Amino acid sequence: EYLERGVDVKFTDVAGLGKIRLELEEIVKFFTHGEMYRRRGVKIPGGILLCGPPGVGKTLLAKAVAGEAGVNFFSISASQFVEIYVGVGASRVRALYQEARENAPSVVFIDELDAVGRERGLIKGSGGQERDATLNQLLVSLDGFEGRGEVITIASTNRPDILDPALVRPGRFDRKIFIPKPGLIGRMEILQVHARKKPMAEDLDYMAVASMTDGMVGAELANIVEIAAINMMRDGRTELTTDDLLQAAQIEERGMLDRKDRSLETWRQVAINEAAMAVVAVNFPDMKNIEFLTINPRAGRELGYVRVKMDHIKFKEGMLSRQSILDHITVQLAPRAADELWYGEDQLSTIWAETSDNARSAARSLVLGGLSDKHHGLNNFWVADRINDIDVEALRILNMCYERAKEILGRNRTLMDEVVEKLVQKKSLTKQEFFTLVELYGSSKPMPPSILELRKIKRLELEEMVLKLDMTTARNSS
């Protein structure tokens, strides 16, 4: 009933494994070299749990490790265990573990334990009672009494925090393996292994494609492959090339490109907004690298957009400076000030009503996030005066950033005009031409010194003053 036929997935059919594959072949060793494991006085760990984002191929990983193990494979949905009546689920898991026991050697797979692995006492109902009964039955089948060494369970959950502490107790679910989002090389391998089944060209550098689809799951890479199969009848070309995959990545990243009737002043307004955004984005190190700048309307966003990719390591670790945030608010204050510099204060539009709210939210978050230097951070107080004064600093930072944005914008009026003319004329601008116009019409942008230069100057100053103390002690003593 719960048995499958025709399992042939191996480690070659799955891509982007890394050192996890090593752990995977450990399971193969657990299924092959087990006599040496047992002779060294070691109990076989029967519980492995794969945790990660959905779409990483948890079922594919289970199929691959089952095929490489060379044993019978069981894959069962956990939603079948939950029933409006109580009792059938415990019998189902008992019969499941029994047929797994008699089919030894074998490996079983149970996906989405979050339906049946919830805490006992979070919902008051008969369904919760059935869930508790099934959880206890699987608890007693896994470790409860002696008599199982050859059946190994495989678990695949997206939220490991809902797991019962009874299950993760040593002896039931001890091995925990995280399968993360693919980085760079995993995306190459997944795209290539999904693209073997389609005729493909030899000039196809997937590096740029994966450099566009940063931080996307393997199922999304399969989708990118899927938007590289049909759509070529409109032009009718010969072979799949780089630009087709680049456009497919652009489509799956933002949406379908649609053209509608429009006036000229609307295009001028949108291009002025995008021009302000890009011009202020140029003058800061936090978002200097600009790739695309367009004003074409898309699905869900009539307004234009800009693309920037600074290294994604500081955001994950949280090492962003205060100057990194105070600039960004200025960037989010780029559109409205441009309106004040182009149409007057009496004719402010309502297109920047979203970025201006982002600027004020970022200012409030920076104020109450400990980055403020009013007393020393201290985003919490007791008396009413200091709590009232907390919000005033957000307004002061907002006004300072708005004035800085206004000054920066007034510094670059010629670059403003040239890039806005190019935006209304071409509707899309790449990195090369935009940076060429920035070089032709830009002003001075003195970059503030980084951490290394400040460290070096402070180190030489410290050494010189400590050696000054050295002579002022020595020649005074000698």
């Binding site: 890394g18 990660g52 995280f178 993360p180 980085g183 390591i313 500081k314 090492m319 980084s450 290394l452």
Partner: protein, 50 residues
């Protein structure tokens, strides 16, 4: 034994391939923070936690 205890106390949480180019401006901040902690711990010693 040390590695078994290390994996059993759950130090690792990302579970990803540990190969990342760390910038100098990150190692510098980490080293300065650790030096500050070391200096403040040596200057103000704790009787039970050396």
């Amino acid at each position: 034994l040390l590695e078994a205890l290390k994996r059993q106390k759950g130090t690792f949480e990302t579970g990803q391939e540990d190969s990342t180019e760390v910038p100098e401006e990150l190692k510098l901040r980490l080293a300065y923070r650790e030096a500050a902690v070391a200096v403040l711990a040596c200057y103000l010693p704790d009787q039970y936690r050396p």
